[PDB]
Design a protein around this ligand. Structure first.
Ligand code: CLA
Ligand code: CLA
Ligand code: CLA
Ligand code: CLA
Ligand code: CLA
Ligand code: CLA
Ligand code: CLA
Ligand code: CLA
Ligand SMILES: CC1=C(/C=C/C(C)=C/C=C/C(C)=C/C=C/C=C(C)/C=C/C=C(C)/C=C/C2=C(C)CCCC2(C)C)C(C)(C)CCC1
Ligand SMILES: CC1=C(C/C=C(\C)CCC[C@H](C)CCC[C@H](C)CCCC(C)C)C(=O)c2ccccc2C1=O
Ligand SMILES: CC1=C(C/C=C(\C)CCC[C@H](C)CCC[C@H](C)CCCC(C)C)C(=O)c2ccccc2C1=O
Ligand code: SF4
Lengths: 74, 734, 222, 63, 80, 53, 165
């Protein structure tokens, strides 16, 4: 029954979650750049993800556009 | 492949990308850099293009006349114009629903018409139209004239009538004809129309193409003109008990000098406008005989430029050798033309809100708002163009050895002083203006509104007392009854001006106070800043210290890469690119300010302005928030009314604007990689790898996306503000 | 139905942010555009204007654009929560049924953008704009400052460092005239730093605005 | 022979140089048929982070 | 194709060649500097204009320039 | 195939979908219009794609 | 008077605003006790408020139609009608202190350029030298006009100008 507390707590934790997830993206990228050595990592889940990144990103692009048109055009 | 489009640039019609389409649309009017372009060919293409532009202008005006005459109600509007609204044109949209058309049908019409917030009705009622038939005749005439200009434009390209190069670059013979003919004779003929038609239509008569040859404009007629009794054309002018479209209190004069306004119509008298066009017709025709043509007595412009170098050498060579750069270059002349036309446009706006010329203007308020806002924004764009072509002049057409020691090289010698001092004034105005506004905000937010700085603008009030506004208790030069100027002008042209300047209901010399102080400083900040960006872009176009051979790249080049710390946005094009934002901001300030001051004037409480204009929350709450109540209620789950289209345009603007941010914030290469994965996807998809691109898809280039983002920013900005202004002012008073 | 539509809005923005970040991760070492993007490192501005123009190809800039989209998605989420709660949950039990704070207008208005702009942003800002003189004016005064910082970010986002380098050079001349040349040298910000400062101010201004608005509203009427 | 001696302070006159109209210190003057024999150091750096440059005979002045 | 020009202030330090990711620069004998070398651009049809040659040049205002020009399918770096 | 599938959504979701017995007519006519425009697109694609070797 | 206003002493709007502020303040005051620190702070606010109104009435300020003070920025006008203490004296005060700060800074810069590493003494302040120069310039304008009249204030044209012209 303290409305301001409810709104503030939900909003605050929402924002902190968002920032942390973006940070996850950034440091995964930093591992991709610096500490990745392909000699110890030959045929592998990470290797195969890198090896069909084009299919991955193309389909993610498609579904983004589909949701865009429908969800906002409504 | 080596495709046809476009034929002007061979290197452009070579690459297998989609860059050729956009660039072919972009370099079409860059005549100076096509293939095989000589100089004669350049001038001839420019000439024919001018004819094209004239054709389009006259055709457009014919269109306005035709639609007003056919779908409007100009025949009914002239009986009572403080009443039934103007009608622009009628709508036939198959997308409408029942309450939509039931709503839009307004102004006495029979279908979906929309109101004409353009001021054409007042113009055509003042100049002497009265019925539809005259408007149709005008439309047919202007369409015919447009066809004539189009044909002439085709004519002067045909190889027997192509003017040679030296027919152009003839300064002295073009100015005599322009100044005498184009200005003077046109002004004299317009005086003819005012005297013969517009005045007797304002007395009550139908002087048409029939029987204008048999009607005396003045009941004496060309006797006093050839005797030298000219003041007999001014005896017994129109009484102040006048009714405009009838003969009630009608006078007989045709050339007076009264000043002031019309007492019943709130416009300038027609006789004063006749006299004015007559006088400046004489002045321009006399001024048209200055220069030399195939005769004796004329001047030479080169001699005049040569002899004006001051002794003691405070200027090096003075104006030596300028005449061979004004004459030889086009971007210089275009820069001067845009500068003059932009300043004159501003002057048009500034005089037409305060001294309204047209009958029953300033009782249609939406007309005032749209006209003034329109001309202000036009002036802004024109001035920005002037400085842009200054920069193009420096890069393409400047020659140092021809300009060794004139003022043009002096300006390049000490440019750091210019940029420094423009930077200084911009900083000073910024700090103090923003500081005073923030201080007033803090004082208003806490419970104490008397603890805030409210400087009284005593200079402009001194000037307003100098013009005759007898309210500030200064008593000098026109407000004092024993001055020389007051007593000399008293007998004929003052008493109208004093009654028009002491009225607190017209727009002439509004009462001012501290809010006006603060806003005028904000405006000065806008002008100095925009001048800083543009002048810096122009003068640093030959080269900088970050790059001392910028002249080898041309006007609009992307960057110089990551080296030397990276040089994004280094071209002069990008300097102008940054300046456009400031232009939009500054005109935003002047137009917000004008609009709110006149809203509080037309509603009735100037106190609300003089109190809430001194702190930014006053603007946000009392202008943007309060006045957008009837706008966004243009449609709701309960219904809709007239201003639904505006309430849709109002969101449309935002959408364009926000899309504008995308091309600005997110630069290119990301999109290049995304488009490449798209290429893979369409290449390997079964049943859709049967359709290919003919020209390979690529992302937009670095220079282009700046232009596109700026286009979205400007278009969304303009549509949003136009929607708010029209909807708010016409929702309250309309 | 309004819930259906807003939920798919949430799904849309989440997928877009996933697109940007995952694309940054996968194209961090190399791509068809740059075959040796690994040797340029994690944080680098470009690879010149060549091959069309290669601004923002590092994974770092993918993080940058991801920050913008995170802002967008979460703004929508918290707007959804605020209006849904004020329209369908909270309110007083006046022993005459339930009278909510905003009367229960979510199901009829959350399908038009005009609905959001009017009923949410324009209707619910009456307390944050009229808080002057009361014990709540700090919010109505930090509102405007948040706007100011938001609009201040745009200079850093839109423009570029060559222009500022030249302007700073001219002011350095104006100091060389008066013998106040700083012996450390004034240089404009690097490209990456200009972008980063831009996004910092952007997020600060936007989030501060939302903070002020929420707290003034719900502390005033809640 | 050909140039000013090392340790001396010179003043640059080549305009496109970043150190135009400023003061540098000479390191060595090449005696061969090189087109630019004078090696000048500077106490500050240009935009690229370099503090040393060659110059021609007539573009430096002993000052 | 772009325009790559080598100027005479070159000292022949081979930095531009090791920075070119497309092998359009090469060192030719020359008798104008201490190193007795000078860069040259015999293959500017393969250049894409990335401007790493400009970044690698030590001598102030540079001894190598890359003027941008009419793009082709090789100067855009298109792999598809 | 494509015409028969394209007719449907105009019938069920077009602006003439509640007025009985004429909701089918407007949908079918609009679908025929769309097919017409697709034919035009095919023709100009033929004019642009196979225009060379 | 001065551009159509009246001094705040007989200004009707002035007393109305004063009464309004006292009214809201007493309204806040009513619901507490007579010994509580809330009431202590509220009465302190009353005292400061009424003292502020008296101080603004005493200084001969000028109020428009809103009852708010207006400042006059004009040397002849303010010096003639007794208003030198609202723009004129403040501007000379500010110019004094601002030129003081600038002059002290400039003297520091010249004082540290003459060393072996000018950058270290810029990043790490020489505190004895900085305090010394912080005192030594309380009379700056005299030293400023001397540096001007001797021609050492301005560098000559050995400044680096952009190349080319
Ligand atoms: C557990 C959390 C965590 C940890 C340990 C790290 C740790 C690191 N990150 Mg990282 N990051 C995180 C979360 C985290 N991050 C999140 C949530 C994001 C998304 C925003 C990022 C985004 C990110 C990027 C994009 C980069 C890093 C980088 C780095 C490395 C260098 C950091 C550095 O030098 O900062 C120095 C400290 C600062 C710059 C402080 C400035 C921060 C801002 C400007 C202040 C915030 C303003 C404040 C809230 C309000 C202002 C108050 C008042 C002044 C007005 C380091 C390993 C960098 C790298 O290269 O790694 C090798 C890099 O490029 N991170
Ligand atoms: C409101 C402004 C705006 C809009 C509309 C978009 C739109 C888009 N951005 Mg975006 N962006 C913006 C601002 C905006 N951005 C800003 C400010 C930034 C900086 C941070 C970015 C950064 C950014 C990145 C980094 C990415 C996007 C992506 C996208 C795309 C997502 C797919 C989608 O929804 O398309 C659908 C299109 C719409 C929803 C637009 C409205 C369409 C209407 C409703 C219907 C269209 C039919 C039309 C009326 C018919 C035309 C008729 C006419 C010819 C007569 C889309 C094109 C992503 C992308 O492309 O991958 C998917 C992506 O990677 N943008
Ligand atoms: C008397 C003879 C004469 C006349 C009438 C003209 C007239 C014209 N010449 Mg021209 N010309 C002449 C002799 C003449 N010239 C000679 C002898 C030469 C050889 C030296 C040239 C060489 C020449 C060239 C090379 C070019 C022209 C061009 C033009 C046109 C200018 C564009 C325009 O419409 O401006 C209209 C301008 C005005 C009406 C005056 C504006 C005055 C102020 C600024 C406006 C405000 C007044 C008022 C408030 C407006 C009322 C608004 C109303 C709606 C309420 C114009 C038709 C140009 C052109 O368009 O080519 C087709 C062009 O390129 N001429
Ligand atoms: C007297 C008028 C005039 C004339 C004759 C010229 C003539 C010229 N200008 Mg210029 N200019 C003008 C006014 C003028 N300008 C003004 C007012 C500005 C300020 C905005 C500029 C700014 C400007 C720049 C910055 C540049 C020029 C350039 C040029 C040259 C090439 C033009 C070209 O290729 O464009 C081709 C034209 C187009 C591709 C049209 C683009 C369409 C624009 C973006 C408007 C789109 C808005 C859209 C219609 C809105 C629709 C709304 C929707 C809802 C319906 C040419 C000599 C260029 C030049 O010399 O290159 C070196 C150049 O760089 N001018
Ligand atoms: C909110 C938006 C905003 C603001 C405030 C400014 C402000 C400024 N711009 Mg502009 N600009 C903007 C948007 C904005 N711009 C946008 C969107 C663009 C398009 C890219 C540009 C493009 C642009 C260009 C191209 C140029 C400017 C210039 C300027 C300066 C003009 C001089 C002036 O007014 O000094 C007043 C300065 C201020 C009000 C700055 C605020 C200083 C604050 C009040 C002090 C700090 C307070 C406090 C200590 C902070 C504590 C926090 C702590 C954590 C540090 C000034 C810094 C010009 C310039 O620099 O000329 C000299 C210039 O060349 N701007
Ligand atoms: C993108 C979102 C979106 C959606 C879903 C709709 C949907 C609709 N609009 Mg609409 N509209 C939108 C955006 C949208 N609008 C926007 C942005 C605008 C403003 C520009 C409008 C403006 C507008 C107007 C002005 C009108 C509509 C109307 C309509 C209705 C009929 C349209 C019609 O005949 O469709 C034609 C149908 C098709 C093209 C069907 C194609 C889709 C097929 C079925 C996809 C199948 C994919 C399948 C799963 C693939 C499987 C492959 C497998 C077999 C191998 C329909 C409910 C009309 C109406 O009366 O509404 C009731 C109407 O008058 N709209
Ligand atoms: C100024 C341009 C313009 C015009 C005149 C129209 C006109 C129309 N639009 Mg439209 N529209 C436009 C631009 C325009 N649009 C744009 C730019 C967009 C995108 C934003 C749309 C999007 C849009 C949608 C989404 C829809 C319309 C629809 C309609 C129709 C509504 C009338 C009605 O109530 O349905 C009555 C409709 C009919 C009676 C059907 C007539 C079908 C055509 C006209 C006849 C074809 C004849 C036949 C095929 C020829 C035989 C060929 C032979 C080989 C057999 C009408 C024909 C609606 C529509 O027609 O779709 C169902 C609709 O749903 N519009
Ligand atoms: C920023 C420019 C500026 C402007 C617009 C004004 C405006 C004004 N000053 Mg003023 N003034 C200024 C700067 C300015 N001051 C400065 C910097 C000084 C200090 C040197 C003065 C010193 C001053 C005195 C001593 C007097 C005024 C007076 C006046 C008023 C009438 C005289 C006038 O306008 O002369 C035109 C002003 C200028 C062109 C600007 C240059 C400033 C000169 C030096 C002031 C001229 C004073 C004038 C000759 C006195 C006329 C006496 C009057 C009875 C006719 C008028 C309100 C008179 C007054 O009280 O009016 C009632 C008066 O007696 N001023
Ligand atoms: C960049 C460039 C350029 C351009 C520039 C510009 C754009 C400029 C502008 C300018 C301007 C835009 C200016 C303005 C001016 C104005 C003025 C100068 C004004 C004056 C006024 C007066 C003088 C007035 C007076 C009076 C009064 C006060 C009131 C009463 C009446 C009388 C008349 C007495 C060019 C092309 C050249 C080329 C080079 C480069
Ligand atoms: C979206 C985007 C792209 C991708 C844009 C593409 C691929 C083009 C999108 C346009 C589509 C193909 C058509 C748009 C529809 C318009 C109505 C077309 C108008 C054409 C005129 C001739 C009327 C960039 O290449 C880019 C480059 C640099 C900075 C920012 C951006 C950027 O934001
Ligand atoms: C304004 C601007 C600059 C110029 C901004 C600069 C130089 C930052 C200046 C910050 C402060 C004012 C300088 C540091 C002040 C020192 C700490 C001096 C002490 C001051 C005392 C008051 C503490 C860029 O360098 C830039 C680069 C890339 C894209 C956009 C931009 C950009 O928009
Ligand atoms: S514009 Fe792009 S390519 Fe050029 S320097 Fe800037 S980031 Fe790099």
């Amino acid at each position: 029954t303290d409305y301001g507390t409810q709104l503030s707590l939900f909003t605050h934790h929402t924002w902190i979650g968002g920032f942390c997830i973006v940070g996850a993206g950034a440091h995964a990228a930093i591992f991709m750049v610096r500490d990745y050595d392909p000699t110890n990592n030959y045929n592998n889940l990470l290797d195969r993800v890198i090896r069909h990144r084009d299919a991955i990103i193309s389909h993610l692009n498609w579904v983004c556009i589909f949701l865009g048109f429908h969800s906002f055009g409504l | 492949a080596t495709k046809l489009f476009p034929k002007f640039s061979q290197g452009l019609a070579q690459d297998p990308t989609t860059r050729r389409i956009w660039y072919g649309l972009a370099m079409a009017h860059d005549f100076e850099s096509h293939d095989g372009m000589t100089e004669e060919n350049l001038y001839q293409k420019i000439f024919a293009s001018h004819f094209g532009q004239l054709s389009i202008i006259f055709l457009w005006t014919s269109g306005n006349l035709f639609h007003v005459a056919w779908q409007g109600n100009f025949e009914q509007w002239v009986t009572d114009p403080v009443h039934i609204r103007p009608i622009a044109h009628a709508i036939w949209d198959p997308h409408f629903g029942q309450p939509a058309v039931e709503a839009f049908t307004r102004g006495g019409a029979s279908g979906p018409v929309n109101i004409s917030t353009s001021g054409v009705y007042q113009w055509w009622y003042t100049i002497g139209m009265r019925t539809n038939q005259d408007l149709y005749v005008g439309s047919v005439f202007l369409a015919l004239v447009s066809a004539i200009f189009l044909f002439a434009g085709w004519l002067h390209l045909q190889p027997n009538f192509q003017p040679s190069l030296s027919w152009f670059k003839d300064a002295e013979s073009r100015l005599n004809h322009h100044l005498s003919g184009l200005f003077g004779v046109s002004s004299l003929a317009w005086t003819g129309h005012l005297v013969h038609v517009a005045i007797p239509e304002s007395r009550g008569q139908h002087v048409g193409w029939d029987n204008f040859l048999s009607v005396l404009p003045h009941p004496q007629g060309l006797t006093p003109f050839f005797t030298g009794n000219w003041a007999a054309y001014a005896q017994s002018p129109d009484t102040a008990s006048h009714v405009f479209g009838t003969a009630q209190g009608s006078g007989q004069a045709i050339l007076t000098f009264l000043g002031g306004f019309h007492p019943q119509t709130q416009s300038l008298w027609l006789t004063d406008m006749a006299h004015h066009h007559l006088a400046i017709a004489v002045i321009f025709i006399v001024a048209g005989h200055m220069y030399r043509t195939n005769f004796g007595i004329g001047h030479r412009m080169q001699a005049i430029l040569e002899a004006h170098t001051p002794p003691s050498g405070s200027l090096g060579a003075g104006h030596k050798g300028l005449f061979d750069t004004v004459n030889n270059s086009l971007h210089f002349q275009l820069g001067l033309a845009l500068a003059s036309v932009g300043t004159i446009t501003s002057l048009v706006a500034q005089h037409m809100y305060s001294l309204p010329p047209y009958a029953f203007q300033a009782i249609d308020f939406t007309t005032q708002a749209a006209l003034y806002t329109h001309h202000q924004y036009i002036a802004g764009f024109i001035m920005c163009g002037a400085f842009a072509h200054g920069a193009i002049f420096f890069i393409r057409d400047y020659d140092p050895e021809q300009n060794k020691g004139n003022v043009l090289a002096r300006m390049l010698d000490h440019k750091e002083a210019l940029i420094s001092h423009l930077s200084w004034v911009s900083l000073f105005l910024g700090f103090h203006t923003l500081g005073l506004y923030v201080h007033n905000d803090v004082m208003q937010a806490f419970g104490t509104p008397e603890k805030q700085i409210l400087i009284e603008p005593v200079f402009a009030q001194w000037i307003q007392a100098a013009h005759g506004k007898a309210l500030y208790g200064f008593d000098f030069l026109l407000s004092s009854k024993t001055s020389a100027a007051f007593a000399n002008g008293q007998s004929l042209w003052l008493p109208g001006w004093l009654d028009a300047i002491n009225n607190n209901q017209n727009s002439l010399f509004l009462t001012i106070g501290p809010g006006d102080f603060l806003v005028h400083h904000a405006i000065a900040l806008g002008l100095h800043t925009t001048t800083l960006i543009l002048v810096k872009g122009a003068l640093d176009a030959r080269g900088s210290k970050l790059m001392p051979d910028k002249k080898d790249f041309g006007y609009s080049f992307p960057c110089d890469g990551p080296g030397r710390g990276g040089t994004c946005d280094i071209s002069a094009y990008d300097a102008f690119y940054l300046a456009v934002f400031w232009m939009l901001n500054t005109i935003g300030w002047v137009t917000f300010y004008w609009h709110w001051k006149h809203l509080t004037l037309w509603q009735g409480n100037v106190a609300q302005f003089d109190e809430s204009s001194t702190y930014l929350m006053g603007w946000l709450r009392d202008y943007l928030w309060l006045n957008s109540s009837q706008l966004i209620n243009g449609y709701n789950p309960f219904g809709m009314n007239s201003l639904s289209v505006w309430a849709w345009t109002f969101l449309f603007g935002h959408l364009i604007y926000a899309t504008g941010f995308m091309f600005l914030i997110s630069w290119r290469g990301y999109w290049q990689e995304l488009i490449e994965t798209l290429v893979w996807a369409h290449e390997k998809t079964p049943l859709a790898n049967l359709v290919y691109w003919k020209d390979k898809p690529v992302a937009l280039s670095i220079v282009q996306a700046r232009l596109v983002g700026l286009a979205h920013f400007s278009v969304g900005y303009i549509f949003t503000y136009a929607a708010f202004l029209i909807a708010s002012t016409s929702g309250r008073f309309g | 139905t309004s819930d259906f539509m807003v939920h798919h809005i949430h799904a849309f923005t989440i997928h877009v942010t996933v697109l940007i970040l995952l694309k940054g991760v996968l194209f961090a070492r190399s791509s068809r555009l740059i075959p040796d993007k690994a040797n340029l490192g994690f944080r680098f501005p470009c690879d010149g204007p060549g091959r069309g123009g290669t601004c923002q190809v590092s994974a770092w800039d993918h993080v940058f654009l991801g920050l913008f989209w995170m802002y967008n998605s979460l703004s929508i989420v918290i707007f959804h929560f605020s209006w849904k709660m004020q329209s369908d949950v909270w309110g007083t039990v006046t022993a005459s049924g339930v009278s909510h704070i905003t009367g229960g207008n979510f199901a009829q208005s959350a399908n038009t953008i005009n609905g959001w702009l009017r009923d949410f942003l324009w209707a619910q800002s009456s307390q944050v704009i009229q808080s002057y003189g009361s014990a709540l004016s700090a919010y109505g005064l930090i509102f405007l400052g948040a706007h100011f910082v938001w609009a201040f970010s745009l200079m850093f986002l839109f423009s570029g460092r060559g222009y500022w380098q030249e302007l700073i050079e001219s002011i350095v001349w104006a100091h060389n005239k008066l013998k106040v040349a700083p012996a450390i040298q004034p240089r404009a910000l690097s490209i990456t730093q200009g972008r980063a400062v831009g996004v910092a101010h952007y997020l600060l201004g936007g989030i501060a605005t939302t903070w002020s608005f929420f707290l003034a509203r719900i502390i005033s009427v809640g | 022979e050909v140039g000013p001696k090392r340790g001396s302070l010179v003043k640059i006159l080549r305009p496109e140089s970043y150190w135009f109209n400023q003061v540098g210190k000479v390191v060595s003057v090449d005696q061969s048929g090189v087109r630019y024999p004078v090696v000048v150091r500077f106490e500050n750096q240009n935009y690229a982070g370099v503090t040393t440059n060659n110059y021609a005979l007539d573009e430096v002045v002993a000052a | 194709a772009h325009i790559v020009k080598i100027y005479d202030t070159c000292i022949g330090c081979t930095q531009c060649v090791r920075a070119c990711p497309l092998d359009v620069l090469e060192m030719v004998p020359w008798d104008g500097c201490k190193a007795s070398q000078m860069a040259s651009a015999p293959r500017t049809e393969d250049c894409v204009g990335c401007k790493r040659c400009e970044t690698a040049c030590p001598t102030d205002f540079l001894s190598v320039r890359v003027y941008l020009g009419s793009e082709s399918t090789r100067s855009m770096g298109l792999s598809y | 195939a494509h015409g028969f599938l394209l007719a449907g959504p105009f019938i069920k979701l077009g602006p003439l979908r509640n007025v009985p017995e004429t909701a089918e007519i407007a949908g079918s006519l609009s679908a025929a219009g769309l097919v017409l425009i697709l034919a035009l697109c095919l023709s100009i694609y033929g004019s642009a794609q196979f225009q060379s070797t | 008077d001065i551009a159509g206003l009246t001094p705040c002493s007989e200004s009707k709007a002035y007393a109305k605003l004063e009464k309004k502020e006292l009214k809201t303040l007493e309204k806040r005051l009513k619901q507490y006790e007579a010994d509580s620190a809330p009431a202590v702070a509220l009465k302190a606010t009353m005292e400061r408020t009424k003292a502020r109104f008296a101080n603004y009435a005493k200084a001969g300020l000028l109020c428009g139609n809103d009852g708010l003070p207006h400042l006059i920025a004009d040397p002849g006008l303010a010096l003639k009608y007794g208003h030198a203490g609202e723009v004129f004296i403040p501007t000379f005060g500010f110019l004094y202190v601002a030129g003081y700060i600038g002059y002290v800074g400039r003297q520091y810069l010249i004082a540290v350029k003459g060393e072996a590493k000018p950058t270290d003494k810029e990043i790490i302040i020489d505190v004895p030298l900085a305090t010394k120069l912080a005192w030594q310039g309380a009379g700056w304008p005299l030293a400023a006009v001397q540096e001007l009249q001797r021609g050492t204030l301005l560098e000559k044209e050995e400044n680096i100008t952009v190349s080319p012209r």
